[PDB]
Amino acid sequence: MRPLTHEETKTFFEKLAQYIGKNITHLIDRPDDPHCFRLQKDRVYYVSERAMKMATSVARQNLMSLGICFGKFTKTNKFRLHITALDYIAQYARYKIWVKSNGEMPFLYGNHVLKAHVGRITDDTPQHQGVVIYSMNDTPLGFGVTARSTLELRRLEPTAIVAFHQADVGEYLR
Amino acid sequence: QLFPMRFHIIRSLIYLSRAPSLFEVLDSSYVSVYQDGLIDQLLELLSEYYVLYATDISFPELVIPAIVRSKRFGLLTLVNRLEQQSKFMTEKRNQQKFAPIDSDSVEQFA
Amino acid sequence: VSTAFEIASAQGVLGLFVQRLYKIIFPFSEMEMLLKCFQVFFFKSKNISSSRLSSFSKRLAIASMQLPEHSASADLALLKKLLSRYSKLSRLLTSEEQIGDGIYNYEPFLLKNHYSPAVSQSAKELL
Amino acid sequence: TIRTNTLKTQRRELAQALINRGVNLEPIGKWSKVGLQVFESQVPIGATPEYLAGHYILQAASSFLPVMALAPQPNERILDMSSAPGGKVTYVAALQKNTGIIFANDSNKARTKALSANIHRLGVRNAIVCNYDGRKFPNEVIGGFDRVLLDAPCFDTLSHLQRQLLLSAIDSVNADSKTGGFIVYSTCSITVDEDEAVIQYALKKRPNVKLVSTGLEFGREGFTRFREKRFHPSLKLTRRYYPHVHNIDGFFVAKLKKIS
RNA sequence: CAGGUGGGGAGUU
């Protein structure tokens, strides 16, 4: 249980902005409830003020988890190792890619999203930009990095790959 | 000078019915001895309007814009009473979990 | 806010403006300008109807207890003709972020009792 | 039986998804409006996309009954003596609509990790995972919880442990709370010496705790006289379920209110 | 007043 350092916060802010853009301020500031980020071991957890008040009494070694984890802080200060923040990032995702049922199973299994399996796109998704994969029922699926843009994806072969999967909802039970 | 005439018209309208005009009168520079009497009359009219609409399920929702305006602007007692009425209405709405088709439960709560 | 929406509406292409527009409804409670702005926001491609529109429309429904019935009917018809399948905008809905000032977690019942007799008919038609 | 998470999806939507997936599910009686009992399911229930997304959680009807008996309120401090396996905590969080503070305590770290994973899957954000003794929790960790959920494990040593946990829960329950100092005690067995004797011992130990009706529409009343052992008149308010009576796993549910 | 937390801070090895 440690307060997040300025360097650590700045390292994760860019990663959050890679998927949510400037919408991170919405979660950062909330007058309704002081829900902020906290660092427990290597797992950053977004918890409320009351949760921090309750987790204050809990011991740092004893407190295994609290709130929702945004990903373990690796040696190179990398994030998204945990997909528990997918629900939070779904409401603030700048780019959303809807995948049909053909690629829905491979996405759950962790396979990259193929061009033939891409149903709907935001039409303004840049290459190597953090986007959010979604299903036909407007349900979050996982994390996927798209290496191609809509301008080139409008005319592409079915066998081509568009978005490479990095996290999925199936990892919760896998 | 014509504020007492407006208050009398508001009281007559409230009796016939049984907010924006009352808020404007309350927020007027005169209201916000004669000024105190007009403020008391406006508060009584606002309380009567709140009591008349208290039976409605959406009473806290309707009074929410007035509560925000009152908070931004006797006045403390009226605001506290309005907040208590909104809290009671919200609790009643939360308890009334029946679907919109079963409007009898809402009417019974009303 | 209307000018900002018009600028963003330019072909081939704002949260503070959106927040200002949402918060300005309460002081308002001009109708044609508001209807045009709502139509432009609805006309935006996939920028709305992601469960956020219902939260925005909840304040509009609450503020619809006043003003002419024709304006209120047009505001209701704006969401009635919307392609979104959400139906809880006229009742309890999801959390009300963006300043809030409302239920986070009714109006038509009170709208039926109104000076204009057509208000009750419009509420019944909406229900 | 699977309990649908209201914080994730509606019961009707979950039923439609199950019908589309080819799982025959029906409502579990009238007491529970969200519990769905699956009779036939070609696809695996635990491997369903809705289950993975957290729409439904496999929980027993008897286990879900203690959550209904507790009846947690929004913006309230509810502490659970046994957080494992997490189904009761998820039901309490769903009832609270992600409001208030939920104190989830699990003495076993192995079960605590599973409970934390289930909480993350369900999406509960106001739940705190802690590993401390239930008896020492009221005095050493935190007390004054508005609601107490004592899902005591369910022979002489177990009864003594259950009595100790009940006393700690009563002490941890705040009688001055606005929502009321309600403590719900649940057991996994229908043993008289485990449920009725513990309730009588707890009532004698704490005069400020008075037995109240659990509010369950089904369940056998608590026994007042069993052979030479006689229980207090208020013990009849306890709800008892049997496999041959309620068609569910045997459990005993009791509700106590703290005055001082 | 008592308790929890406490590489947050101060001090010992």
PDB file of C-alpha atoms in Angstrom, chain D residues 15-258:
ATOM      1  CA  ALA D  15     -33.456 -15.432 -19.758  1.00  0.00           C
ATOM      2  CA  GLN D  16     -33.540 -14.416 -23.429  1.00  0.00           C
ATOM      3  CA  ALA D  17     -29.784 -14.986 -23.724  1.00  0.00           C
ATOM      4  CA  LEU D  18     -30.120 -18.417 -22.102  1.00  0.00           C
ATOM      5  CA  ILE D  19     -32.977 -19.284 -24.472  1.00  0.00           C
ATOM      6  CA  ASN D  20     -30.852 -18.178 -27.431  1.00  0.00           C
ATOM      7  CA  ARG D  21     -27.918 -20.215 -26.092  1.00  0.00           C
ATOM      8  CA  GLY D  22     -30.165 -23.274 -25.762  1.00  0.00           C
ATOM      9  CA  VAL D  23     -30.362 -23.521 -21.957  1.00  0.00           C
ATOM     10  CA  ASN D  24     -33.748 -24.377 -20.444  1.00  0.00           C
ATOM     11  CA  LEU D  25     -34.109 -22.064 -17.438  1.00  0.00           C
ATOM     12  CA  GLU D  26     -37.130 -21.063 -15.354  1.00  0.00           C
ATOM     13  CA  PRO D  27     -37.589 -18.738 -12.371  1.00  0.00           C
ATOM     14  CA  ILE D  28     -36.793 -20.287  -8.990  1.00  0.00           C
ATOM     15  CA  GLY D  29     -40.205 -19.964  -7.380  1.00  0.00           C
ATOM     16  CA  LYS D  30     -41.716 -16.618  -6.444  1.00  0.00           C
ATOM     17  CA  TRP D  31     -39.483 -15.669  -3.497  1.00  0.00           C
ATOM     18  CA  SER D  32     -36.567 -14.883  -5.838  1.00  0.00           C
ATOM     19  CA  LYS D  33     -37.329 -12.757  -8.903  1.00  0.00           C
ATOM     20  CA  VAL D  34     -33.859 -13.190 -10.442  1.00  0.00           C
ATOM     21  CA  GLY D  35     -32.787 -16.753  -9.590  1.00  0.00           C
ATOM     22  CA  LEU D  36     -33.111 -19.043 -12.611  1.00  0.00           C
ATOM     23  CA  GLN D  37     -33.162 -22.837 -12.316  1.00  0.00           C
ATOM     24  CA  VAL D  38     -31.599 -24.625 -15.294  1.00  0.00           C
ATOM     25  CA  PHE D  39     -33.190 -27.966 -16.180  1.00  0.00           C
ATOM     26  CA  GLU D  40     -31.458 -28.699 -19.504  1.00  0.00           C
ATOM     27  CA  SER D  41     -28.498 -26.960 -21.142  1.00  0.00           C
ATOM     28  CA  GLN D  42     -26.608 -28.380 -24.118  1.00  0.00           C
ATOM     29  CA  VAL D  43     -23.855 -25.751 -23.819  1.00  0.00           C
ATOM     30  CA  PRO D  44     -21.823 -25.461 -20.588  1.00  0.00           C
ATOM     31  CA  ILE D  45     -23.427 -23.031 -18.151  1.00  0.00           C
ATOM     32  CA  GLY D  46     -20.091 -21.997 -16.640  1.00  0.00           C
ATOM     33  CA  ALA D  47     -18.522 -21.469 -20.074  1.00  0.00           C
ATOM     34  CA  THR D  48     -21.355 -19.279 -21.370  1.00  0.00           C
ATOM     35  CA  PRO D  49     -20.397 -15.776 -22.566  1.00  0.00           C
ATOM     36  CA  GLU D  50     -22.919 -14.255 -20.152  1.00  0.00           C
ATOM     37  CA  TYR D  51     -21.385 -16.191 -17.252  1.00  0.00           C
ATOM     38  CA  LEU D  52     -17.911 -15.066 -18.330  1.00  0.00           C
ATOM     39  CA  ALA D  53     -19.137 -11.466 -18.604  1.00  0.00           C
ATOM     40  CA  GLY D  54     -20.707 -11.735 -15.138  1.00  0.00           C
ATOM     41  CA  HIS D  55     -24.373 -11.613 -16.164  1.00  0.00           C
ATOM     42  CA  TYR D  56     -25.165 -14.716 -14.084  1.00  0.00           C
ATOM     43  CA  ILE D  57     -23.375 -16.318 -11.131  1.00  0.00           C
ATOM     44  CA  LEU D  58     -23.940 -19.923 -10.054  1.00  0.00           C
ATOM     45  CA  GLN D  59     -25.397 -19.623  -6.547  1.00  0.00           C
ATOM     46  CA  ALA D  60     -27.723 -21.816  -4.512  1.00  0.00           C
ATOM     47  CA  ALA D  61     -31.271 -20.723  -3.736  1.00  0.00           C
ATOM     48  CA  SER D  62     -30.672 -21.297  -0.018  1.00  0.00           C
ATOM     49  CA  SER D  63     -27.489 -19.211  -0.210  1.00  0.00           C
ATOM     50  CA  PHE D  64     -29.392 -16.438  -1.997  1.00  0.00           C
ATOM     51  CA  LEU D  65     -32.058 -16.589   0.722  1.00  0.00           C
ATOM     52  CA  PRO D  66     -29.669 -15.259   3.428  1.00  0.00           C
ATOM     53  CA  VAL D  67     -29.013 -12.167   1.295  1.00  0.00           C
ATOM     54  CA  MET D  68     -32.758 -11.520   1.067  1.00  0.00           C
ATOM     55  CA  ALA D  69     -33.108 -12.069   4.822  1.00  0.00           C
ATOM     56  CA  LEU D  70     -30.288  -9.600   5.500  1.00  0.00           C
ATOM     57  CA  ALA D  71     -31.888  -7.045   3.129  1.00  0.00           C
ATOM     58  CA  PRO D  72     -28.912  -4.674   2.773  1.00  0.00           C
ATOM     59  CA  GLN D  73     -29.703  -1.021   2.144  1.00  0.00           C
ATOM     60  CA  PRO D  74     -27.919   1.468  -0.135  1.00  0.00           C
ATOM     61  CA  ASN D  75     -25.231   3.695   1.386  1.00  0.00           C
ATOM     62  CA  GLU D  76     -24.875   1.338   4.359  1.00  0.00           C
ATOM     63  CA  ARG D  77     -21.934  -0.413   6.020  1.00  0.00           C
ATOM     64  CA  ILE D  78     -22.505  -4.163   5.615  1.00  0.00           C
ATOM     65  CA  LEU D  79     -19.882  -6.592   6.933  1.00  0.00           C
ATOM     66  CA  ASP D  80     -19.842 -10.313   6.125  1.00  0.00           C
ATOM     67  CA  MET D  81     -18.151 -12.727   8.524  1.00  0.00           C
ATOM     68  CA  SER D  82     -17.486 -15.273   5.746  1.00  0.00           C
ATOM     69  CA  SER D  83     -16.892 -13.713   2.330  1.00  0.00           C
ATOM     70  CA  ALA D  84     -16.366 -17.107   0.693  1.00  0.00           C
ATOM     71  CA  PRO D  85     -17.440 -18.188  -1.853  1.00  0.00           C
ATOM     72  CA  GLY D  86     -18.472 -14.651  -2.847  1.00  0.00           C
ATOM     73  CA  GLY D  87     -21.974 -15.415  -4.114  1.00  0.00           C
ATOM     74  CA  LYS D  88     -23.629 -13.885  -1.052  1.00  0.00           C
ATOM     75  CA  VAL D  89     -21.356 -10.831  -1.276  1.00  0.00           C
ATOM     76  CA  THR D  90     -22.232 -10.385  -4.956  1.00  0.00           C
ATOM     77  CA  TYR D  91     -25.947 -10.663  -4.162  1.00  0.00           C
ATOM     78  CA  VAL D  92     -25.565  -8.126  -1.341  1.00  0.00           C
ATOM     79  CA  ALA D  93     -23.677  -5.759  -3.652  1.00  0.00           C
ATOM     80  CA  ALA D  94     -26.366  -6.157  -6.321  1.00  0.00           C
ATOM     81  CA  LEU D  95     -29.062  -5.384  -3.744  1.00  0.00           C
ATOM     82  CA  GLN D  96     -27.073  -2.353  -2.557  1.00  0.00           C
ATOM     83  CA  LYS D  97     -26.704  -1.212  -6.207  1.00  0.00           C
ATOM     84  CA  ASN D  98     -22.965  -0.601  -5.706  1.00  0.00           C
ATOM     85  CA  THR D  99     -23.636   1.743  -2.778  1.00  0.00           C
ATOM     86  CA  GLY D 100     -22.203   1.786   0.720  1.00  0.00           C
ATOM     87  CA  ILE D 101     -19.216  -0.108   2.082  1.00  0.00           C
ATOM     88  CA  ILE D 102     -19.098  -3.914   1.901  1.00  0.00           C
ATOM     89  CA  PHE D 103     -16.591  -5.543   4.267  1.00  0.00           C
ATOM     90  CA  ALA D 104     -15.726  -8.949   2.798  1.00  0.00           C
ATOM     91  CA  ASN D 105     -13.658 -11.043   5.220  1.00  0.00           C
ATOM     92  CA  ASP D 106     -12.280 -14.503   4.423  1.00  0.00           C
ATOM     93  CA  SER D 107     -10.035 -16.369   6.852  1.00  0.00           C
ATOM     94  CA  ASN D 108      -8.691 -18.593   4.049  1.00  0.00           C
ATOM     95  CA  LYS D 109      -6.425 -16.873   1.526  1.00  0.00           C
ATOM     96  CA  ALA D 110      -7.101 -19.558  -1.096  1.00  0.00           C
ATOM     97  CA  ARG D 111     -10.840 -18.865  -0.941  1.00  0.00           C
ATOM     98  CA  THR D 112     -10.179 -15.118  -0.677  1.00  0.00           C
ATOM     99  CA  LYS D 113      -8.403 -15.094  -4.049  1.00  0.00           C
ATOM    100  CA  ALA D 114     -11.346 -16.895  -5.663  1.00  0.00           C
ATOM    101  CA  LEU D 115     -13.772 -14.469  -4.007  1.00  0.00           C
ATOM    102  CA  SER D 116     -11.737 -11.510  -5.281  1.00  0.00           C
ATOM    103  CA  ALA D 117     -11.758 -12.976  -8.797  1.00  0.00           C
ATOM    104  CA  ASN D 118     -15.531 -13.472  -8.616  1.00  0.00           C
ATOM    105  CA  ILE D 119     -15.975  -9.892  -7.382  1.00  0.00           C
ATOM    106  CA  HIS D 120     -13.870  -8.589 -10.276  1.00  0.00           C
ATOM    107  CA  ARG D 121     -15.907 -10.657 -12.741  1.00  0.00           C
ATOM    108  CA  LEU D 122     -19.168  -9.403 -11.217  1.00  0.00           C
ATOM    109  CA  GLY D 123     -17.940  -5.799 -11.364  1.00  0.00           C
ATOM    110  CA  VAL D 124     -18.418  -4.875  -7.701  1.00  0.00           C
ATOM    111  CA  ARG D 125     -16.475  -1.695  -6.933  1.00  0.00           C
ATOM    112  CA  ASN D 126     -17.473  -1.002  -3.301  1.00  0.00           C
ATOM    113  CA  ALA D 127     -16.242  -4.336  -1.886  1.00  0.00           C
ATOM    114  CA  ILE D 128     -13.112  -4.558   0.278  1.00  0.00           C
ATOM    115  CA  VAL D 129     -11.265  -7.882   0.522  1.00  0.00           C
ATOM    116  CA  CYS D 130      -9.610  -8.532   3.886  1.00  0.00           C
ATOM    117  CA  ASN D 131      -8.101 -11.573   5.612  1.00  0.00           C
ATOM    118  CA  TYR D 132      -8.716 -11.474   9.365  1.00  0.00           C
ATOM    119  CA  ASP D 133     -10.345 -13.570  12.065  1.00  0.00           C
ATOM    120  CA  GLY D 134     -14.081 -13.027  12.392  1.00  0.00           C
ATOM    121  CA  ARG D 135     -13.980 -13.113  16.192  1.00  0.00           C
ATOM    122  CA  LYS D 136     -11.235 -10.471  16.358  1.00  0.00           C
ATOM    123  CA  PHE D 137     -12.657  -8.411  13.476  1.00  0.00           C
ATOM    124  CA  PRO D 138     -15.209  -6.449  15.580  1.00  0.00           C
ATOM    125  CA  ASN D 139     -12.550  -5.252  18.048  1.00  0.00           C
ATOM    126  CA  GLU D 140      -9.243  -5.374  16.142  1.00  0.00           C
ATOM    127  CA  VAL D 141     -10.198  -4.550  12.538  1.00  0.00           C
ATOM    128  CA  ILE D 142     -13.446  -2.553  12.445  1.00  0.00           C
ATOM    129  CA  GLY D 143     -16.885  -2.456  14.042  1.00  0.00           C
ATOM    130  CA  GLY D 144     -20.159  -0.593  13.884  1.00  0.00           C
ATOM    131  CA  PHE D 145     -21.318  -2.145  10.619  1.00  0.00           C
ATOM    132  CA  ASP D 146     -24.908  -1.210   9.806  1.00  0.00           C
ATOM    133  CA  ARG D 147     -25.686  -4.774   8.690  1.00  0.00           C
ATOM    134  CA  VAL D 148     -24.032  -8.037   9.731  1.00  0.00           C
ATOM    135  CA  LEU D 149     -24.057 -11.194   7.590  1.00  0.00           C
ATOM    136  CA  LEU D 150     -22.825 -14.194   9.601  1.00  0.00           C
ATOM    137  CA  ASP D 151     -22.772 -17.159   7.208  1.00  0.00           C
ATOM    138  CA  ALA D 152     -21.455 -19.497   9.876  1.00  0.00           C
ATOM    139  CA  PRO D 153     -19.931 -22.746   8.562  1.00  0.00           C
ATOM    140  CA  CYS D 154     -21.906 -25.886   9.356  1.00  0.00           C
ATOM    141  CA  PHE D 155     -19.990 -30.658  15.835  1.00  0.00           C
ATOM    142  CA  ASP D 156     -19.292 -29.309  19.320  1.00  0.00           C
ATOM    143  CA  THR D 157     -16.274 -27.339  18.086  1.00  0.00           C
ATOM    144  CA  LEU D 158     -18.280 -25.952  15.159  1.00  0.00           C
ATOM    145  CA  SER D 159     -21.085 -24.850  17.489  1.00  0.00           C
ATOM    146  CA  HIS D 160     -18.562 -23.156  19.786  1.00  0.00           C
ATOM    147  CA  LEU D 161     -16.962 -21.434  16.790  1.00  0.00           C
ATOM    148  CA  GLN D 162     -20.395 -20.411  15.491  1.00  0.00           C
ATOM    149  CA  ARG D 163     -21.322 -18.972  18.894  1.00  0.00           C
ATOM    150  CA  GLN D 164     -18.052 -17.020  19.017  1.00  0.00           C
ATOM    151  CA  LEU D 165     -18.631 -15.678  15.499  1.00  0.00           C
ATOM    152  CA  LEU D 166     -22.215 -14.711  16.363  1.00  0.00           C
ATOM    153  CA  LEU D 167     -21.040 -12.795  19.439  1.00  0.00           C
ATOM    154  CA  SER D 168     -18.458 -10.933  17.348  1.00  0.00           C
ATOM    155  CA  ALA D 169     -21.090 -10.133  14.713  1.00  0.00           C
ATOM    156  CA  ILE D 170     -23.453  -8.804  17.393  1.00  0.00           C
ATOM    157  CA  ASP D 171     -20.658  -6.643  18.812  1.00  0.00           C
ATOM    158  CA  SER D 172     -19.700  -5.474  15.315  1.00  0.00           C
ATOM    159  CA  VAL D 173     -23.341  -4.587  14.604  1.00  0.00           C
ATOM    160  CA  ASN D 174     -24.098  -0.958  15.467  1.00  0.00           C
ATOM    161  CA  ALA D 175     -27.410  -0.568  17.291  1.00  0.00           C
ATOM    162  CA  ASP D 176     -27.277   3.209  16.712  1.00  0.00           C
ATOM    163  CA  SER D 177     -27.118   2.865  12.915  1.00  0.00           C
ATOM    164  CA  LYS D 178     -29.829   4.711  11.001  1.00  0.00           C
ATOM    165  CA  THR D 179     -30.526   1.641   8.850  1.00  0.00           C
ATOM    166  CA  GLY D 180     -30.792  -0.462  12.020  1.00  0.00           C
ATOM    167  CA  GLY D 181     -28.455  -2.959  13.651  1.00  0.00           C
ATOM    168  CA  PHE D 182     -29.676  -6.042  11.794  1.00  0.00           C
ATOM    169  CA  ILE D 183     -27.601  -9.236  11.927  1.00  0.00           C
ATOM    170  CA  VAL D 184     -28.518 -12.183   9.691  1.00  0.00           C
ATOM    171  CA  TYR D 185     -27.152 -15.576  10.749  1.00  0.00           C
ATOM    172  CA  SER D 186     -27.149 -18.389   8.185  1.00  0.00           C
ATOM    173  CA  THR D 187     -26.121 -22.036   8.474  1.00  0.00           C
ATOM    174  CA  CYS D 188     -25.412 -24.768   5.931  1.00  0.00           C
ATOM    175  CA  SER D 189     -27.005 -27.498   8.083  1.00  0.00           C
ATOM    176  CA  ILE D 190     -30.357 -28.016   9.785  1.00  0.00           C
ATOM    177  CA  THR D 191     -28.853 -29.325  13.042  1.00  0.00           C
ATOM    178  CA  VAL D 192     -30.852 -28.131  16.051  1.00  0.00           C
ATOM    179  CA  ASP D 193     -27.764 -27.895  18.267  1.00  0.00           C
ATOM    180  CA  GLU D 194     -26.014 -25.826  15.577  1.00  0.00           C
ATOM    181  CA  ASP D 195     -28.808 -23.323  14.825  1.00  0.00           C
ATOM    182  CA  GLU D 196     -31.308 -23.219  17.701  1.00  0.00           C
ATOM    183  CA  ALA D 197     -28.786 -23.721  20.515  1.00  0.00           C
ATOM    184  CA  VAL D 198     -26.444 -21.085  19.069  1.00  0.00           C
ATOM    185  CA  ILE D 199     -29.341 -18.634  18.703  1.00  0.00           C
ATOM    186  CA  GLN D 200     -30.436 -19.228  22.301  1.00  0.00           C
ATOM    187  CA  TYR D 201     -26.851 -18.884  23.549  1.00  0.00           C
ATOM    188  CA  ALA D 202     -26.367 -15.648  21.596  1.00  0.00           C
ATOM    189  CA  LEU D 203     -29.658 -14.233  22.896  1.00  0.00           C
ATOM    190  CA  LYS D 204     -28.703 -15.070  26.487  1.00  0.00           C
ATOM    191  CA  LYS D 205     -25.212 -13.605  26.046  1.00  0.00           C
ATOM    192  CA  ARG D 206     -26.501 -10.357  24.488  1.00  0.00           C
ATOM    193  CA  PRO D 207     -29.803  -9.091  25.951  1.00  0.00           C
ATOM    194  CA  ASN D 208     -29.686  -6.113  23.559  1.00  0.00           C
ATOM    195  CA  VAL D 209     -30.226  -8.443  20.568  1.00  0.00           C
ATOM    196  CA  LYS D 210     -33.842  -9.450  19.913  1.00  0.00           C
ATOM    197  CA  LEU D 211     -34.906 -12.085  17.398  1.00  0.00           C
ATOM    198  CA  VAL D 212     -37.055 -10.792  14.535  1.00  0.00           C
ATOM    199  CA  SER D 213     -38.888 -12.341  11.607  1.00  0.00           C
ATOM    200  CA  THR D 214     -36.569 -13.194   8.722  1.00  0.00           C
ATOM    201  CA  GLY D 215     -39.218 -12.133   6.196  1.00  0.00           C
ATOM    202  CA  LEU D 216     -38.851 -15.303   4.115  1.00  0.00           C
ATOM    203  CA  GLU D 217     -42.089 -16.368   2.436  1.00  0.00           C
ATOM    204  CA  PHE D 218     -41.006 -20.020   2.760  1.00  0.00           C
ATOM    205  CA  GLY D 219     -39.221 -22.027   5.428  1.00  0.00           C
ATOM    206  CA  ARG D 220     -40.083 -24.012   8.542  1.00  0.00           C
ATOM    207  CA  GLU D 221     -40.358 -22.053  11.778  1.00  0.00           C
ATOM    208  CA  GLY D 222     -37.684 -22.491  14.420  1.00  0.00           C
ATOM    209  CA  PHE D 223     -38.272 -25.215  16.990  1.00  0.00           C
ATOM    210  CA  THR D 224     -39.210 -24.000  20.469  1.00  0.00           C
ATOM    211  CA  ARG D 225     -39.020 -27.394  22.219  1.00  0.00           C
ATOM    212  CA  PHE D 226     -36.768 -30.263  21.098  1.00  0.00           C
ATOM    213  CA  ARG D 227     -36.856 -33.304  23.427  1.00  0.00           C
ATOM    214  CA  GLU D 228     -35.553 -32.059  26.814  1.00  0.00           C
ATOM    215  CA  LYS D 229     -34.100 -28.905  25.210  1.00  0.00           C
ATOM    216  CA  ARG D 230     -36.460 -25.915  25.177  1.00  0.00           C
ATOM    217  CA  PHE D 231     -35.759 -22.799  23.112  1.00  0.00           C
ATOM    218  CA  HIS D 232     -36.948 -19.238  23.595  1.00  0.00           C
ATOM    219  CA  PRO D 233     -40.340 -18.222  22.161  1.00  0.00           C
ATOM    220  CA  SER D 234     -38.630 -15.837  19.721  1.00  0.00           C
ATOM    221  CA  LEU D 235     -36.712 -18.765  18.185  1.00  0.00           C
ATOM    222  CA  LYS D 236     -39.787 -19.617  16.086  1.00  0.00           C
ATOM    223  CA  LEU D 237     -39.037 -16.601  13.868  1.00  0.00           C
ATOM    224  CA  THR D 238     -36.103 -18.510  12.352  1.00  0.00           C
ATOM    225  CA  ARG D 239     -36.646 -19.958   8.877  1.00  0.00           C
ATOM    226  CA  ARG D 240     -35.652 -23.585   8.274  1.00  0.00           C
ATOM    227  CA  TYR D 241     -35.472 -25.221   4.841  1.00  0.00           C
ATOM    228  CA  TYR D 242     -35.241 -28.941   4.119  1.00  0.00           C
ATOM    229  CA  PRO D 243     -34.559 -30.976   0.966  1.00  0.00           C
ATOM    230  CA  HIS D 244     -37.895 -32.782   1.388  1.00  0.00           C
ATOM    231  CA  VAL D 245     -39.802 -29.578   2.290  1.00  0.00           C
ATOM    232  CA  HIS D 246     -38.477 -26.626   0.260  1.00  0.00           C
ATOM    233  CA  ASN D 247     -36.789 -28.808  -2.414  1.00  0.00           C
ATOM    234  CA  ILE D 248     -33.540 -26.951  -1.631  1.00  0.00           C
ATOM    235  CA  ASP D 249     -30.412 -27.575   0.421  1.00  0.00           C
ATOM    236  CA  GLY D 250     -31.052 -27.568   4.163  1.00  0.00           C
ATOM    237  CA  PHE D 251     -30.334 -24.224   5.810  1.00  0.00           C
ATOM    238  CA  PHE D 252     -31.313 -22.183   8.861  1.00  0.00           C
ATOM    239  CA  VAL D 253     -31.750 -18.402   8.717  1.00  0.00           C
ATOM    240  CA  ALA D 254     -32.180 -16.119  11.732  1.00  0.00           C
ATOM    241  CA  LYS D 255     -32.555 -12.348  12.029  1.00  0.00           C
ATOM    242  CA  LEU D 256     -31.592 -10.321  15.102  1.00  0.00           C
ATOM    243  CA  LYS D 257     -32.012  -6.612  15.846  1.00  0.00           C
ATOM    244  CA  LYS D 258     -29.707  -4.755  18.238  1.00  0.00           C
TER     245      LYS D 258
END
